[PDB]
Amino acid sequence: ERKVEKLLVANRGEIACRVFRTCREMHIRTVALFCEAERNAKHVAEADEAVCIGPPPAVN
Amino acid sequence: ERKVEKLLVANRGEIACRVFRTCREMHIRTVALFCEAERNAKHVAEADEAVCIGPPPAVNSYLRGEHIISVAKQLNVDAIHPGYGFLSENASFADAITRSGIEFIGPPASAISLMGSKSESKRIMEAAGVPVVPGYYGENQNVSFLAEEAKKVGFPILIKAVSGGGGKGMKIVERPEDFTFMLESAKREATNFFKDDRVILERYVKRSRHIECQIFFDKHGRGVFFFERDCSVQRRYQKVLEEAPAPHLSMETRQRIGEVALQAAKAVGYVGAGTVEFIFDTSTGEFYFMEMNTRLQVEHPVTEEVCRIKGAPLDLVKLQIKTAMGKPLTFSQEDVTLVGSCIEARVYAESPERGFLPESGPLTFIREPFQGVRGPARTRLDTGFREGDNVLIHYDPMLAKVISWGRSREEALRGLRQALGEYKVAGINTNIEFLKRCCETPEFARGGVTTNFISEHESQLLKSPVVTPEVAAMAATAWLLNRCDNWRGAFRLNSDTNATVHFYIDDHPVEVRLHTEGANYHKIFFSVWDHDGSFEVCSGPVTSKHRDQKSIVNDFTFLFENGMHHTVLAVATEGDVTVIGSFGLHQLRLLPLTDGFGDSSTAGGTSTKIVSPMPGKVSKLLVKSGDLVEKGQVLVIVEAMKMEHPVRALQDGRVSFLVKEGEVVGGDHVLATVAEEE
């Protein structure tokens, strides 16, 4: 099998925090994603690293 | 039996808090002890009363056993627990406590005295019949005697010598039926290493792994051995990481380790808690006695995670008080069962890059790992220091102990990894990076490590992450902002701002330049090691206006253009900038630029120095010729009508005298030439 130590999340919101939490118990790293601004949001304050992706519209 | 309501502690540190805690559950009083100052320490803030004992040196503090006993008598103390170190191993102190009537906690003085000398101790165990590997048999009376007992007393051949660690007489001669090379090897060893011609033969073991079983005894003839332990990992005779369940140890053996251990303790007679240490070779498959300690170890809470008595959690210190109570036990060796695995590691306030030399400094910020249960594992941290405390050079460098109990070894080891990573301290370099390096790359997850395991992998270890050019960007920025309004309200004309920081990374100065374009404090760039980029930075609340030695601890956010974002708690000072984040911890030393700013004189100072007025009559010159004079001492004192008027020259460099005391000299004479030391 293949080892996992880094977890990536696509969406934002309740699911981000839920996926992030259990991850702590499995002792796995976390990564967050956020749109323009949207950096004070909680999920990013819960992960290990966050990356900005671009303009607010869901296309972008 | 005798009632106990007052408990006395000798030593200081983690053991003080541990002994103090359980005491609360038994509902017993507490007393603390502290050296000069050392009154803000935690343990004293945990007890009921604390007493100062005297000067910092260990001779002055915690060694005046008679004074401690008199103070305890004045307090009408019920019991004393020495702990480990100081008077932990001193039979006179225990005897004096017994004469005073206080219940000493530990073995009787006779056992400590007997085990103080190695020869008489090994004599006692040899009489008892425990398999013991001795250090010597007779002497080299005859060379044929070597062949006589080579295949007799000990088939494995340990030639060595009477003393000295050179050991060239060994030659690693593990092959029996050797008779023409062993004598030649011994005779070539005698050359240039004569010492005493006596030679001792022993068994030679190829591999060594340390084992140490625990034991407990009441005073009513009843005891039970705890689970074994492993101390294979140790550097320079210092414990590093240990495991209570010796991985790869058959149950049957466990049982037997006990029967041997109980025989030895009964033979000498023993009360309280103790530990027997063995030495083991995998190839032979047998264990031979090496040493025992009649004192509670530091590794007691470790073995606890792998033993339960009557289904209940075990407390080792509890029983020792109950043993002192005179009550008899309640359980046989059976009620105790092991459950799961655990690992331990010690953190030392030393510098791994350096010669593991202790460092003393204030504790700026101390992260605390989550000490709660989650997943399939229990992780705990015990620390004898807190925020605002300072490390004392007199004491050993010892911060905290981290233990990861688990249902399986894997869970335990994995748990630690994350915890070891999480705990963070700022202010003094630690070996925490070393321990993590000891855990990741070495394939000791299998469980087989020898006593010398640390020695071979020293090349692999002693390795730390490389400071990326980005790390300098956040570190450099914090020092400015965490010192002043640099880049705050700044403004120039038809131009743009610029400010630079110099870092003395390793032995090479490092320059980082930061500047802005537009009307934006937010948009910032950087150029370090010929690497350029852009980022934005958003700070937090401004704190620590007094900017003392602790300086300012603030959180930072950095949005680099590529797209990332970071959070960094930076406690920056003039000496260094410390940044802690997902990268880890890194402290960058700022290029030092100090050199008697003012007094920087390279003048030759050839002549016409400390000239005296007309009357002259020099005398009482108190400076040696050709000795450096940087501070302005009285080079020459001349008297003019009772006018000493000392010249007090401050020109740096050695001063050369051309005059002698009592010699009348003319006006403005060259009494001495104050020249730079050449």
XYZ file of C-alpha atoms in Angstrom:
738
model
C 0.000 0.000 0.000
C 0.896 3.700 -0.218
C 1.631 5.838 2.836
C -0.332 9.058 3.408
C 0.962 11.999 5.449
C -0.561 15.022 3.660
C -4.290 15.632 3.172
C -5.801 18.128 0.724
C -9.300 19.625 0.863
C -11.132 21.176 -2.079
C -14.234 22.915 -0.751
C -14.786 25.297 2.178
C -17.107 25.421 5.158
C -18.308 22.880 7.697
C -16.802 20.011 5.706
C -13.358 21.638 5.832
C -13.339 21.716 9.633
C -14.800 18.204 9.868
C -12.190 16.705 7.539
C -9.498 18.657 9.378
C -10.487 17.481 12.869
C -10.361 13.694 12.610
C -7.121 14.200 10.715
C -5.540 15.240 14.003
C -6.377 11.896 15.549
C -4.882 9.960 12.674
C -1.891 12.240 13.100
C -1.888 13.434 9.465
C -0.865 16.835 8.027
C -3.441 19.278 6.757
C -3.779 21.809 3.918
C -6.420 24.535 3.449
C -7.665 26.463 0.399
C -9.286 29.894 0.282
C -10.567 32.415 -2.226
C -9.646 36.061 -2.552
C -9.333 37.300 1.008
C -11.312 34.716 2.959
C -8.163 34.275 5.018
C -9.605 35.057 8.425
C -11.967 32.156 7.980
C -11.802 29.450 10.609
C -10.792 26.526 8.499
C -7.502 28.182 7.503
C -6.875 28.884 11.199
C -7.295 25.119 11.686
C -4.985 23.691 9.001
C -1.188 23.648 8.730
C -0.914 25.672 5.505
C -3.354 27.596 3.279
C -3.133 28.774 -0.336
C -5.095 31.517 -2.097
C -6.619 30.429 -5.404
C -8.168 33.486 -7.036
C -11.234 35.542 -7.793
C -14.495 35.050 -5.848
C -16.699 33.705 -8.686
C -16.903 29.929 -8.552
C -15.593 29.749 -12.118
C -12.398 31.439 -10.929
C 2.000 1.358 62.703
C 2.942 5.053 62.679
C 0.682 7.759 61.262
C 2.011 10.118 58.575
C 0.626 13.605 57.938
C 3.723 15.573 56.841
C 5.900 14.732 53.830
C 9.392 16.115 53.195
C 11.210 16.272 49.852
C 14.968 16.593 49.421
C 15.679 17.299 45.761
C 14.145 19.753 43.274
C 12.620 19.506 39.824
C 10.182 17.131 38.162
C 10.364 14.711 41.092
C 9.302 17.456 43.515
C 6.075 18.125 41.618
C 5.414 14.405 41.117
C 5.840 13.590 44.811
C 3.733 16.632 45.676
C 0.812 15.740 43.392
C -0.182 12.254 44.527
C 0.221 13.579 48.051
C -2.931 15.610 47.484
C -4.923 12.471 46.812
C -3.695 10.770 49.950
C -4.622 14.003 51.689
C -1.157 14.539 53.219
C 0.682 17.815 53.981
C 3.601 18.952 51.884
C 6.943 20.723 52.415
C 9.294 22.223 49.799
C 13.013 23.083 49.821
C 14.849 25.650 47.713
C 18.303 27.128 47.294
C 19.310 30.766 47.357
C 16.522 32.573 45.551
C 14.899 29.790 43.542
C 11.678 30.824 45.248
C 9.621 31.562 42.162
C 10.108 27.979 41.103
C 6.966 25.951 40.575
C 7.442 23.289 43.163
C 7.412 25.830 46.009
C 4.209 27.273 44.524
C 2.816 23.730 44.826
C 3.693 22.819 48.429
C 2.309 24.087 51.741
C 5.564 25.548 53.095
C 9.083 26.109 51.712
C 12.435 26.711 53.418
C 15.607 28.267 52.006
C 18.737 26.210 52.641
C 21.722 28.222 51.437
C 24.292 28.908 48.769
C 23.859 27.598 45.197
C 26.798 25.134 45.092
C 25.612 21.601 45.754
C 28.045 21.348 48.666
C 26.200 24.227 50.335
C 22.670 23.286 49.219
C 20.963 19.878 49.640
C 24.103 18.294 51.158
C 23.930 19.620 54.743
C 22.101 16.485 55.821
C 22.485 17.289 59.516
C 20.939 20.740 59.028
C 18.103 19.225 56.991
C 17.471 16.702 59.767
C 17.470 19.387 62.469
C 15.031 21.505 60.441
C 12.792 18.476 59.876
C 12.841 17.706 63.601
C 11.841 21.293 64.378
C 8.970 20.884 61.902
C 8.111 17.461 63.416
C 8.175 15.867 59.968
C 6.741 12.370 59.543
C 8.577 11.163 56.417
C 11.336 12.199 54.006
C 11.729 11.140 50.382
C 15.305 11.818 49.195
C 14.583 11.329 45.524
C 17.509 10.792 43.164
C 20.809 12.627 43.473
C 22.343 14.561 46.368
C 21.792 12.373 49.483
C 19.979 9.662 47.507
C 22.862 7.226 48.114
C 24.299 7.958 51.564
C 23.898 5.473 54.409
C 24.952 7.939 57.112
C 22.028 10.232 56.280
C 19.547 7.342 56.400
C 20.962 6.133 59.721
C 20.700 9.632 61.186
C 17.090 9.856 59.986
C 16.347 6.506 61.629
C 17.952 7.642 64.895
C 15.884 10.842 64.777
C 12.785 8.654 64.403
C 11.601 9.813 60.971
C 10.490 7.123 58.518
C 13.126 7.162 55.789
C 11.765 6.234 52.367
C 13.935 3.690 50.583
C 16.258 0.791 51.345
C 17.978 0.361 54.713
C 21.434 1.853 55.155
C 23.054 -1.600 55.168
C 21.982 -2.343 51.590
C 23.227 1.037 50.354
C 26.596 0.610 52.091
C 26.989 -2.937 50.769
C 26.167 -1.912 47.212
C 28.446 1.120 47.472
C 31.485 -1.100 46.933
C 31.308 -3.130 43.724
C 33.616 -5.899 44.955
C 31.609 -6.722 48.079
C 28.338 -6.465 46.145
C 29.473 -8.910 43.458
C 30.765 -11.111 46.282
C 27.276 -11.124 47.803
C 25.581 -11.996 44.510
C 28.166 -14.701 43.760
C 27.449 -16.217 47.172
C 23.717 -15.950 46.436
C 24.195 -17.944 43.227
C 22.859 -15.469 40.652
C 24.582 -15.781 37.250
C 27.046 -12.889 37.422
C 29.744 -12.065 34.878
C 32.770 -11.145 37.017
C 35.484 -8.679 36.134
C 38.512 -10.778 37.046
C 39.834 -14.220 37.983
C 43.190 -14.240 39.747
C 46.184 -13.032 37.752
C 48.607 -14.041 34.987
C 50.668 -16.319 37.209
C 51.359 -18.700 34.301
C 50.801 -18.431 30.562
C 49.639 -22.064 30.573
C 46.994 -21.100 33.145
C 45.478 -18.967 30.394
C 44.981 -22.095 28.278
C 43.845 -23.981 31.397
C 40.909 -21.680 32.160
C 40.421 -20.496 28.579
C 38.326 -23.582 27.971
C 37.391 -23.849 31.641
C 36.099 -20.907 33.664
C 34.932 -18.963 30.616
C 34.900 -20.467 27.150
C 34.436 -17.055 25.562
C 37.873 -15.468 25.748
C 38.233 -11.952 27.119
C 41.965 -11.323 27.248
C 42.148 -7.526 27.643
C 44.509 -6.395 30.416
C 44.565 -5.477 34.096
C 43.567 -1.897 33.223
C 43.531 0.565 30.340
C 41.002 0.744 27.523
C 43.422 0.084 24.663
C 42.512 -3.588 24.661
C 44.852 -4.644 21.855
C 45.302 -7.914 23.735
C 41.699 -8.749 22.842
C 42.146 -9.001 19.037
C 38.468 -10.103 18.993
C 39.597 -13.718 19.478
C 36.207 -15.423 19.666
C 37.570 -18.690 18.246
C 38.332 -21.354 20.871
C 41.218 -23.814 20.442
C 43.474 -20.753 20.172
C 46.871 -21.282 21.803
C 49.597 -19.787 19.558
C 47.981 -16.369 19.001
C 46.491 -15.508 22.408
C 49.867 -15.638 24.166
C 51.522 -13.675 21.348
C 48.721 -11.098 21.521
C 49.088 -10.772 25.302
C 52.874 -10.417 25.066
C 52.589 -7.755 22.369
C 50.022 -6.010 24.580
C 52.501 -6.031 27.475
C 54.912 -4.029 25.307
C 54.590 -0.252 25.856
C 51.569 -1.054 28.048
C 53.279 -3.066 30.786
C 51.188 -1.648 33.675
C 50.930 -4.729 35.939
C 51.797 -8.096 34.415
C 48.630 -9.618 35.907
C 46.079 -10.535 33.223
C 42.371 -11.224 33.758
C 40.218 -13.487 31.573
C 36.449 -13.189 31.148
C 33.654 -14.074 28.767
C 33.439 -11.845 25.695
C 30.023 -10.817 24.354
C 29.670 -9.609 20.774
C 26.410 -7.719 21.385
C 24.969 -5.872 24.372
C 21.459 -4.657 25.139
C 20.582 -3.357 28.589
C 17.723 -4.765 30.659
C 16.391 -3.590 34.036
C 13.472 -5.183 35.909
C 11.610 -3.303 38.681
C 10.849 -4.618 42.181
C 8.851 -3.695 45.275
C 8.904 -4.866 48.902
C 7.055 -4.146 52.121
C 8.499 -4.621 55.581
C 6.308 -7.611 56.330
C 8.038 -9.982 53.917
C 6.001 -9.646 50.741
C 6.798 -8.205 47.327
C 6.214 -8.310 43.583
C 8.427 -7.587 40.597
C 7.197 -5.051 38.065
C 7.658 -5.321 34.317
C 11.052 -5.233 32.603
C 12.558 -2.261 30.784
C 15.073 -1.399 28.063
C 17.808 1.274 28.069
C 19.668 0.373 24.885
C 19.770 3.983 23.661
C 22.245 6.132 25.588
C 24.922 8.622 24.524
C 27.995 9.216 26.700
C 26.339 7.310 29.560
C 23.298 9.626 29.374
C 19.803 8.198 28.971
C 18.073 9.368 25.794
C 15.040 7.227 24.945
C 13.703 4.051 26.558
C 10.851 1.552 26.288
C 9.151 -0.191 29.206
C 8.018 -3.250 27.141
C 11.199 -4.711 25.801
C 10.152 -5.430 22.307
C 11.082 -8.946 21.188
C 11.056 -10.457 24.682
C 9.442 -13.847 25.283
C 6.913 -14.079 28.091
C 8.671 -17.010 29.708
C 11.853 -14.994 29.979
C 10.001 -12.140 31.579
C 8.902 -14.540 34.259
C 12.424 -15.772 34.903
C 13.951 -12.318 35.024
C 11.776 -11.981 38.097
C 12.932 -15.115 39.893
C 16.568 -14.039 39.552
C 15.797 -10.476 40.648
C 13.820 -11.527 43.734
C 16.623 -13.842 44.874
C 19.173 -11.014 44.896
C 16.923 -8.524 46.696
C 15.928 -11.074 49.348
C 19.567 -12.042 49.914
C 20.607 -8.483 50.763
C 17.210 -7.736 52.309
C 15.209 -4.911 50.796
C 12.242 -2.644 51.515
C 10.571 -0.215 49.132
C 11.011 0.173 45.376
C 14.111 -0.635 43.351
C 15.503 -1.776 40.025
C 17.877 -4.579 39.005
C 19.888 -3.985 35.825
C 21.169 -6.760 33.561
C 23.348 -6.997 30.464
C 22.275 -9.274 27.627
C 23.734 -10.732 24.427
C 21.369 -11.924 21.704
C 23.875 -14.426 20.301
C 24.389 -16.143 23.656
C 20.728 -15.786 24.609
C 21.570 -15.463 28.313
C 21.503 -12.505 30.684
C 24.317 -11.743 33.124
C 24.110 -9.443 36.118
C 25.827 -6.070 35.822
C 24.526 -3.720 38.520
C 21.552 -2.824 40.716
C 20.379 0.530 42.108
C 18.799 0.855 45.568
C 16.882 3.994 44.636
C 13.805 5.010 42.679
C 14.722 5.619 39.051
C 13.725 8.532 36.837
C 12.090 6.054 34.457
C 9.379 5.009 36.918
C 6.379 6.590 35.103
C 7.400 4.827 31.896
C 7.076 1.259 33.142
C 3.775 2.287 34.715
C 2.056 2.579 31.321
C 2.627 -1.140 30.740
C 1.329 -2.488 34.061
C -2.061 -2.575 35.803
C -2.827 -4.090 39.192
C -6.303 -5.559 39.753
C -7.446 -3.739 36.668
C -6.667 -0.378 38.287
C -4.023 2.231 37.392
C -0.761 1.756 39.264
C 0.975 4.543 41.186
C 4.556 3.682 42.124
C 5.101 6.545 44.582
C 1.818 5.774 46.312
C 2.906 2.339 47.369
C 6.231 3.684 48.646
C 4.338 5.908 51.066
C 2.090 2.956 51.916
C 5.215 0.840 52.364
C 6.466 3.478 54.799
C 3.038 3.291 56.458
C 3.788 -0.276 57.550
C 0.681 -1.679 55.880
C 1.192 -4.961 54.033
C 0.471 -5.444 50.327
C -2.831 -6.408 48.799
C -1.750 -8.156 45.622
C 0.356 -11.097 44.502
C 2.653 -10.957 41.497
C -0.365 -12.201 39.564
C -2.801 -9.307 39.894
C -0.446 -7.266 37.738
C -0.950 -7.449 34.002
C 0.626 -5.550 31.093
C -1.512 -3.761 28.509
C -0.088 -2.107 25.432
C 3.217 -0.363 24.787
C 4.839 2.999 25.567
C 7.975 4.974 24.647
C 9.807 7.820 26.409
C 12.252 10.569 25.459
C 14.122 13.214 27.467
C 14.639 16.805 26.315
C 17.875 18.500 27.398
C 18.587 22.245 27.317
C 21.767 21.677 25.321
C 22.976 22.506 21.844
C 23.270 19.588 19.504
C 25.563 21.447 17.109
C 27.956 22.159 19.939
C 29.655 19.793 22.361
C 26.285 19.164 24.074
C 27.158 22.018 26.450
C 24.354 23.233 28.748
C 23.028 26.755 28.238
C 21.289 29.042 30.724
C 18.725 31.621 29.668
C 15.200 32.882 30.295
C 12.319 30.841 28.912
C 10.516 33.054 26.399
C 7.691 30.951 24.938
C 6.897 27.328 25.782
C 4.377 25.482 23.637
C 2.554 22.720 25.471
C 1.607 19.586 23.526
C -1.927 18.271 23.840
C -1.705 16.076 26.950
C -5.067 14.450 26.313
C -6.319 11.149 24.938
C -7.212 10.755 21.316
C -7.143 8.007 18.748
C -5.458 4.812 19.880
C -2.890 6.440 22.139
C -2.148 8.310 25.320
C 0.440 11.089 25.336
C 1.551 13.009 28.419
C 4.151 15.641 29.240
C 5.744 16.322 32.617
C 7.814 19.494 32.908
C 9.591 20.968 35.909
C 9.632 24.440 34.372
C 7.017 26.885 33.116
C 6.783 30.247 31.383
C 8.878 33.035 32.858
C 11.356 30.602 34.405
C 15.119 30.593 33.844
C 17.491 27.637 33.590
C 20.186 27.373 36.260
C 23.669 26.307 35.156
C 24.291 24.531 38.471
C 21.452 22.092 37.814
C 21.501 19.553 35.008
C 19.787 20.597 31.751
C 16.413 18.839 32.001
C 13.164 20.373 30.751
C 10.453 17.743 30.377
C 9.631 14.099 29.701
C 7.213 12.930 26.999
C 5.630 9.459 27.071
C 3.314 7.894 24.471
C 1.287 4.978 25.821
C -0.529 2.909 23.224
C -2.229 -0.394 22.532
C 0.529 -1.249 20.036
C 4.105 -0.133 19.613
C 3.364 1.491 16.319
C 0.720 3.701 17.806
C 3.061 4.718 20.571
C 5.997 5.570 18.313
C 3.780 7.394 15.852
C 2.205 9.345 18.636
C 5.461 10.634 19.943
C 6.591 11.756 16.534
C 3.753 14.208 16.294
C 4.023 15.288 19.905
C 7.768 15.730 19.791
C 7.182 17.886 16.797
C 4.449 19.966 18.461
C 6.235 20.942 21.703
C 8.138 24.175 21.156
C 10.484 26.238 23.253
C 12.052 29.546 22.372
C 15.126 31.013 23.973
C 17.635 28.153 24.262
C 18.738 25.596 21.698
C 17.556 22.069 22.488
C 18.173 18.529 21.241
C 14.520 18.092 20.246
C 15.537 18.177 16.583
C 18.057 15.413 17.297
C 15.489 13.115 18.901
C 13.117 13.442 15.938
C 16.011 12.646 13.601
C 16.708 9.633 15.821
C 13.113 8.493 15.276
C 12.419 9.041 11.562
C 15.304 7.716 9.463
C 16.752 5.002 11.771
C 14.844 1.780 11.198
C 14.690 1.052 14.922
C 10.910 0.701 14.638
C 11.784 -2.983 14.268
C 12.841 -2.949 17.925
C 16.412 -4.234 17.855
C 18.970 -1.668 19.031
C 22.252 -2.351 20.804
C 23.992 -0.424 23.572
C 26.298 1.213 21.008
C 23.403 1.885 18.606
C 23.988 5.637 18.758
C 27.676 5.371 17.840
C 27.387 4.061 14.285
C 24.593 6.340 13.026
C 26.242 9.611 14.076
C 26.863 10.489 10.435
C 23.190 10.104 9.591
C 22.079 12.191 12.556
C 23.029 15.682 13.743
C 21.069 16.980 10.738
C 18.578 19.863 10.670
C 16.392 21.466 7.985
C 18.010 23.967 5.641
C 17.063 27.599 6.207
C 15.258 28.525 2.989
C 15.645 32.091 1.676
C 11.980 32.662 2.536
C 12.611 32.020 6.248
C 14.953 35.015 6.263
C 12.141 37.156 4.842
C 9.728 36.572 7.731
C 12.537 36.577 10.303
C 14.034 39.822 8.994
C 10.658 41.557 8.777
C 9.727 40.665 12.360
C 12.834 42.281 13.857
C 12.020 45.630 12.360
C 8.317 45.688 13.101
C 8.847 44.052 16.442
C 11.116 46.883 17.342
C 9.710 50.014 15.732
C 7.555 51.678 13.100
C 9.863 50.774 10.243
C 7.745 50.766 7.100
C 5.025 52.456 9.131
C 4.120 55.968 8.030
C 7.298 56.004 5.953
C 7.393 58.467 3.056
C 9.876 59.897 0.562
C 9.730 62.018 -2.600
C 9.470 60.713 -6.163
C 11.259 57.627 -4.860
C 10.594 54.430 -2.934
C 11.560 53.097 0.465
C 14.456 50.805 1.387
C 15.634 49.120 4.578
C 18.116 46.301 5.066
C 18.938 43.712 7.724
C 22.234 41.857 8.189
C 22.166 38.263 9.452
C 25.279 36.440 10.665
C 24.206 32.984 9.525
C 26.952 30.451 10.362
C 30.285 32.266 9.775
C 29.106 34.189 6.695
C 27.248 37.525 6.912
C 23.856 37.556 5.190
C 22.180 40.687 3.823
C 18.440 40.959 3.143
C 16.882 44.031 1.514
C 13.204 44.989 1.723
C 11.455 47.752 -0.218
C 8.013 48.849 -1.393
C 6.446 50.142 -4.607
C 3.281 52.210 -4.843
C 1.514 53.720 -1.925
C 1.378 50.303 -0.297
C 2.805 49.312 3.058
C 1.108 46.032 2.260
C 2.894 45.147 -0.984
C 6.428 44.127 -0.046
C 9.325 42.431 -1.828
C 12.619 40.776 -0.930
C 16.011 39.855 -2.350
C 18.175 37.386 -0.423
C 20.854 35.168 -1.998
C 19.952 36.620 -5.410
C 16.361 35.391 -5.083
C 13.520 37.867 -5.564
C 9.783 37.678 -4.995
C 6.785 39.490 -3.582
C 4.511 38.970 -0.610
C 2.088 40.811 1.546
C 2.173 40.795 5.310
C -0.535 41.453 7.903
C 0.547 41.769 11.534
C -1.380 41.347 14.783
C -1.901 43.306 18.000
C 1.107 45.283 19.186
C 2.477 43.892 22.449
C 5.395 44.373 24.851
C 5.970 48.109 24.508
C 8.698 47.883 27.167
C 10.766 45.704 24.755
C 12.747 44.047 27.547
C 14.989 40.979 27.256
C 11.906 38.951 26.320
C 11.109 41.723 23.785
C 7.955 41.344 21.653
C 6.030 38.134 20.959
C 3.520 38.628 18.155
C 1.800 36.506 15.533
C 2.349 37.339 11.870
C 0.675 36.421 8.583
C 2.461 36.419 5.262
C 0.798 36.124 1.891
C 3.474 35.462 -0.710
C 2.543 36.033 -4.339
C 2.866 32.418 -5.429
C -0.202 31.873 -3.292
C 0.806 30.556 0.071
C 0.134 32.019 3.498
C 1.938 31.567 6.777
C 1.578 32.288 10.467
C 4.623 33.121 12.555
C 4.938 33.905 16.269
C 8.127 35.930 16.435
C 9.918 36.775 19.672
C 12.674 38.994 18.322
C 15.574 40.547 20.137
C 18.723 42.446 19.221
C 20.772 39.270 19.610
C 18.622 37.041 17.423
C 15.285 36.558 15.678
C 13.336 33.386 16.454
C 10.558 32.244 14.108
C 8.263 29.303 14.878
C 5.792 27.886 12.383
C 4.945 24.908 10.212
C 8.540 24.998 8.962
C 9.690 24.327 12.522
C 11.811 26.561 14.726
C 14.794 28.567 13.482
C 16.829 31.240 15.247
C 18.911 33.525 13.036
C 21.770 35.392 14.637
C 22.023 39.028 13.718
C 25.427 40.119 12.462
C 27.189 41.550 15.523
C 28.616 45.035 14.960
C 30.210 46.249 18.186
C 33.807 47.252 18.882
C 34.469 49.997 21.417
C 32.637 52.314 19.056
C 34.373 55.322 20.447
C 37.807 54.472 21.649
C 39.090 53.359 18.261
C 42.567 54.910 18.138
C 45.361 53.522 15.953
C 47.677 56.480 16.601
C 51.335 55.547 16.885
C 51.978 57.575 20.021
C 55.695 57.812 19.279
C 56.814 60.589 21.639
C 55.809 63.450 23.936
C 53.496 61.373 26.128
C 52.529 61.958 29.784
C 55.035 64.816 29.785
C 55.551 66.380 33.155
C 55.867 70.090 33.996
C 59.139 71.742 34.934
C 59.545 70.662 38.614
C 59.687 66.979 37.693
C 60.793 64.698 40.539
C 59.005 61.583 39.301
C 58.491 58.800 41.828
C 56.224 55.900 42.788
C 55.514 54.605 39.284
C 53.056 51.716 39.596
C 52.867 50.500 35.965
C 55.046 47.766 34.493
C 56.954 48.577 31.320
C 55.546 46.874 28.248
C 52.073 46.209 29.658
C 48.859 47.127 27.851
C 47.148 50.328 28.987
C 43.660 50.803 27.556
C 41.929 52.074 30.687
C 43.330 55.352 31.962
C 45.391 54.288 34.955
C 48.003 56.570 36.515
C 50.987 55.853 34.266
C 53.306 58.266 36.101
C 52.786 60.548 39.099
C 54.956 63.673 39.217
C 54.977 66.147 42.054
C 54.996 69.901 41.595
C 54.686 71.646 44.909
C 52.663 68.822 46.415
C 50.824 68.541 43.140
C 50.497 64.898 42.386
C 48.425 65.889 39.370
C 48.289 62.328 37.962
C 48.476 62.342 34.174
C 46.054 59.410 33.670
C 46.748 58.637 30.020
C 44.067 56.709 28.120
C 46.068 55.936 24.964
C 45.748 52.232 24.200
C 48.791 49.993 23.884
C 51.740 49.093 26.080
C 53.726 51.929 27.676
C 57.537 51.991 27.654
C 59.346 53.853 30.437
C 62.486 55.895 29.777
C 62.731 57.317 33.328
C 63.276 55.964 36.833
C 61.720 56.830 40.183
C 63.295 59.758 42.008
C 64.807 61.271 38.847
C 64.236 64.997 38.418
C 63.119 65.597 34.832
C 62.806 68.735 32.753
C 59.657 70.402 31.532
C 57.669 68.474 28.916
C 60.164 65.603 29.033
C 59.459 62.308 27.269
C 58.820 60.260 30.402
C 57.355 57.368 28.406
C 56.274 56.450 24.881
C 52.700 55.143 24.788
C 52.634 53.204 21.524
C 50.284 50.672 19.990
C 51.198 47.101 20.864
C 53.243 45.804 17.942
